[PDB]
Amino acid sequence: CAYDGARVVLMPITDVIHLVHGPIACAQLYRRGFTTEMGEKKLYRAILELAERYEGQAKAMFVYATCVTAMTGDDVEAVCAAAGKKVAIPLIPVNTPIGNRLAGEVLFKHVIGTAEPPVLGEYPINLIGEYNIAGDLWGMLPLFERLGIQVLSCFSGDATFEELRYAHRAKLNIIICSKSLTNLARKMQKNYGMPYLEESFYGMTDTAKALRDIARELDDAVGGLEKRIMQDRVEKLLEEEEATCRERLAPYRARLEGKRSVLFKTWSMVNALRELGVEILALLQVMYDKMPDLIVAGGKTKFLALKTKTPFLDINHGRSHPYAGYEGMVTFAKQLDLTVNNPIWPVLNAKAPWEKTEEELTAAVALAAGHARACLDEDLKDSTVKVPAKNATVNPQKNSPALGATLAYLGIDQMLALLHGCSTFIRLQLSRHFKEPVALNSTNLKKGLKKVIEKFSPEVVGVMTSGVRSAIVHFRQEYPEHDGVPVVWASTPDYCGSLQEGYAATVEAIVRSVPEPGETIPGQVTVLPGAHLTPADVEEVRELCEAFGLDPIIVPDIANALDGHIVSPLSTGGVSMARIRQAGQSAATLFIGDSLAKAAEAMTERCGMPSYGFTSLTGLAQVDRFMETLAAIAGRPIPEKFRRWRSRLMDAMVDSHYQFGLKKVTVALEGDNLKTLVNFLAGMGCEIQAAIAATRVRGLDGLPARDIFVGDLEDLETAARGSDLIVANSNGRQAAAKLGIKAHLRAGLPVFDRLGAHQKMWVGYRGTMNLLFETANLFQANA
Amino acid sequence: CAYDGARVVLMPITDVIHLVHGPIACAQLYRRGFTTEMGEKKLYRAILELAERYEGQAKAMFVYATCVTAMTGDDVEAVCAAAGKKVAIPLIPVNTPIGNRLAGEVLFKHVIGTAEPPVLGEYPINLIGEYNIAGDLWGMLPLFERLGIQVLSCFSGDATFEELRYAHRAKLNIIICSKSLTNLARKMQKNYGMPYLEESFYGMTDTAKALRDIARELDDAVGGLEKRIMQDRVEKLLEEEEATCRERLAPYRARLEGKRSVLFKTWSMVNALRELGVEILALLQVMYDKMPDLIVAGGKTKFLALKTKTPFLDINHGRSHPYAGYEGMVTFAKQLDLTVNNPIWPVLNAKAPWEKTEEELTAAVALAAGHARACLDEDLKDSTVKVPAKNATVNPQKNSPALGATLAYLGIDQMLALLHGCSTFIRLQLSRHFKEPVALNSTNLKKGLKKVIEKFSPEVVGVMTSGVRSAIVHFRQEYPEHDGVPVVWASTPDYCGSLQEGYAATVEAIVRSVPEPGETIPGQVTVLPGAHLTPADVEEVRELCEAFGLDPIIVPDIANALDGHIVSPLSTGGVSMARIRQAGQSAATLFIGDSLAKAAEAMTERCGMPSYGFTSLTGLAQVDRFMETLAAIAGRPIPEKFRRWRSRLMDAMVDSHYQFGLKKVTVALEGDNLKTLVNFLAGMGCEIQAAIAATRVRGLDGLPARDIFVGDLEDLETAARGSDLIVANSNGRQAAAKLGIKAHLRAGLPVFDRLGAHQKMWVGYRGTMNLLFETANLFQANA
Ligand code: SF4
Ligand code: SF4
Questions:
Q1: Which InterPro entries has this protein been placed in (chains A, B) (predicted)?
Q2: How many C-beta atoms lie closer than 10 Å to residue A226's C-beta?
């Protein structure tokens, strides 16, 4: 067609109303499209009304005829003549009588020459064909400003109508490709005596030729070749800018050496890639034997290239970054390094769990089985992580271990949690995170224990002390009516730990006391979830285990107690005592979190069950290991729903790795959650500036972070400077607001400022997808 | 204990560093807590360091001794003496030698009297015991300013240390409850000669007594009772403010008349409730016979009251709204009307699907069965919704019907979608919403049809025209090798519709052509999903149907095709042709969306299957009807997982109705999605300002909105003024940024600015919970 050319050239004008006579089919005010209802009188009406409504914000109005209306035959010239004398904002008719002819012709006949420019320097130039795609003209404007050259008119870029009306007084037309306006260049040449130069501004060499030719012709026009001023000035600028851009490109040269690319202007991108040291080789199997590292078909064939599981780069009208000039090609190299050196590609090209050979699956299962002994063999004395050397701590993210002990006792059904008004503070915090009632009756010892067990008739009593066995045996002695009720006694050794240490200690105490050994029940697995798992994650873990045909006994089960559910002074909803007792007959023990390793071993030496450990269930490889271990335990193949979900997560990772790449993130959480989220973010391409841990835990030095320290949330604001994302609890809204970081991901406990924190599922393929999309949208909204 | 009183009184001071010697257990700079590591030398070190670091932002430092340290016996007076001479920011020791004694005593001995006030008017007063809880002092400060009285010191409110050091020069102490500082009031009385008045500022009557007594005593102190100025001024202000507050309370009086409340200061809240016309009557069955409408136990017994399925109100230190003064009690009435007149309570107190009698379930199933005939019997000629009277449309949210036809053809496996370069625009938009390849090859007719069917070997061809049967029978005639391949021909009648009309038309065309009638297969249900459902919703619908033991045949199935999945020029992943053919033997037909009703009837008269219709699957009652219909079709009871999820959704609705209440929302979507979201938001308590629909659809006038019109996204910015939330597609980021609305919920198509839009599940109990939490967090972040 023809109106498509006139559209793509004239619609980019940003201070004009574009009226499109006819249907939507076939079809900052530049973002206001104006379409007439399904007609020359109606177009008269629309012209009048749009002029009156958008007066003061519009400087002109373009009336485009479309395929449909041209068939109707309504003469847009007639309505222009019959309507312009009423509203005086200039109306330009674009009629049917190379689509870029029509554009150049209407532009000369009606737009160019209607206003003498306000400021006409000694070096005005007109750039014809610059669409300012993601600021490619913006990378060249400072160079032209430094050179002393004036851009009087940029056609189809940040083009104001007034700027376009000045093109009559200039000396050089530069056609930045978009050649088909060569007719306009030739026609302004005859009438207005303006030489035209067809230049490309993509690449060092082509930019050099462009600037040299421009300096030459403007030296002819202004002054003479003799006394060349522009030639010397361009030589000087060229030298300095080339030096600076080589110096800035060297780091990216080092990272992008020896990589192989397939290319499917063509030359400009070629030589740019060759400069960066990328060998251009030139259909799945031909790629397999090609082993390409990059696909630079910048075409709209994207989605195919993305699904080929290879890094892909796009050089077209759809790019969202400037590639023109020295800064533009620095950006080009940066985006290349982002998309090619991303950590996701080796993970994505790894073998799926269902296509691994039996030997590899056996090795992975063996690693999962040895996780517990690996954590226990690590001893913290050799840790290089820094002990906090402060004296006064401010903003302490270190919660009390009694909070974790309460969280674990809350997952057991009909539990009386006893602490021995100073206990209130635990109740309010846990309630506010969970928006749920919690029972923490606190405490003569035997008398009170009697009192409670009669009043509430519990089937288990949870006693936690920091810093008595005879007293408990005394209570049992004085009254054997209550002998049946078990008492679980948990101790945290230094009142120097957080929620995680208390949770681990009380879970270990439960594991050592309640379960009884017996004959192994096939299909039964004991799951010891970590404190970093929300109730939704525990429910999802149960569902994943049940999909494999296994019976999950989860100790503790906060997924039904401290989750939204709809009265006794005991805790209800958790795992019953019969289930905890029969959990000692399970075939295997699974724990999610390093801190629980000891607890798992507490079972291993008591009965002999194998223990399988997983640091995290977020990230493709970690969920893959979990599924492999579950398939090995159950003896069944992996269900196909999980195969579909893995494919979905792969697609999401490919599509969202552009927002995570080379972003600065500071994470301040407790040990296990910190490990999980730091590993996930580092595997998705983020640069972790600081890793702030609540307490000294195992494996902190191996985290993929620049700075790892044990600290509070004031060290957060001391170290999160320059970060694009902050991951922490709600208390982190301190350090963000101070540092101006608008991206804060709420994780861990407490999270009291947002609703649904305990219902956030970040486990498995769908949970990883949810976390991925949440973080990607945080990056999108704050940029 | 005692340090708890000194803490609750002295810790609110906002410009002082609070150093707490000892453990965290038992324990705007006011939000900086400073705790010493697990010690008088160490406290010396901490004092020095905290003074040097936070210098310029701190005016003093409080060193509190705790239960633990007092047992250690380290004399905080000794460290104060040994450290104050080094850093001169005043250090105040709070030691052990009614917890409010200690507070008043340290305050007099060290804080009060250290600085003459800068500006001491003729009416300074000291308010003792005002904690500025959510701004209760803030509602009284303008009244005191208008009266000409100066608040020289507010103890424990927005209390700056300098403000506290001035209390030595004043005439009246007013104890705003918090009595236990009466010792401080008596002790300032002896030394500084300042009368103390115990007043309450909660309620019209008590505020009146307070202001009268204050005017009297300050008239004694300043001037004489004779020439009373303050008495006359308070009379004047009292009259005007009482009139204004009665006038503002009348609307809330009308809405809160005859309601019954149970109350579990006590008097002040009583009389306030009685003023508002609420009868105070004074344990589930005693409530059943009490039929209470409101529970005003403002205690921390909240969670129990919330779970009693009754409106609950809280009057304590945890309230997040000011209740003092006339404005404070206007706020009280507003919050009462919000929590009592919410639409969620009648829905929440309705019978669950598993506890309904068989007759009620039969009636609900009959309504679901008659949905289709109800929609078809409605004819649009009588609709009161306004036809758009404009001539030029700007920001057209009306997508082309070819977009919907493409969306439906994309859900069929091995489909060649033919339209007869003008077709590109559909491909880019659908791809950008779905980030997935789409195939829309467009078109001598028989020659081209031959060409394609050989090249791509499809099993179905989709032809869509707007505004030939012999030509199709010609292609079949000329070449019977391709006779088997079915051709589906869809027509939208006026090129005056949106995605929804095209989707419905092509689904109706598929239903009339492909399915074949046969013998009814029990357990098979044909699901016709609406265009407003994302692929995740289609997958969840399939899972809900499969949990009941039913086989869902979903036409079309975009959940596997245009969802993240990992090449042919045809569309893959959708529903195969054998399944669509055998869908004509289903026991029942379910359609989600009014626009699909016709399609359902297209089956009903072709074979005879019953059709069940559901406008939306968001909201407790709608999902309840869906589950009842599914249970009736399958003949099985409702699975218990869904019972747990219903309980979770109920809890979430109770907990989140405070953020949705009386909020202003403007929704601009297509018909079915608009109905769904408008009904959900209106049922959760929001005030829908404007309902902007893309096209004229059935049942638009019955929507719970103030203004319903068919319009574009410019009418959105014309009508969304004053709205707290905007629901629309990504193009809505226009009208929000113009109007300053920072809360924009992305719904419908296209959604190109955020990742994971097509993976958003808003169906069923968990989907309703997800939508609820997303909207609640949007309201929380932008307020
Ligand atoms: S309808 Fe016409 S003007 Fe519109 S895109 Fe197609 S051939 Fe071109
Ligand atoms: S430990 Fe002591 S000061 Fe702390 S809350 Fe308990 S009794 Fe009070």
A1: Nase/OxRdtase_comp1, Nase_comp1_CS, Nase_Mo-Fe_CF, NifE, NifE-like
A2: 6
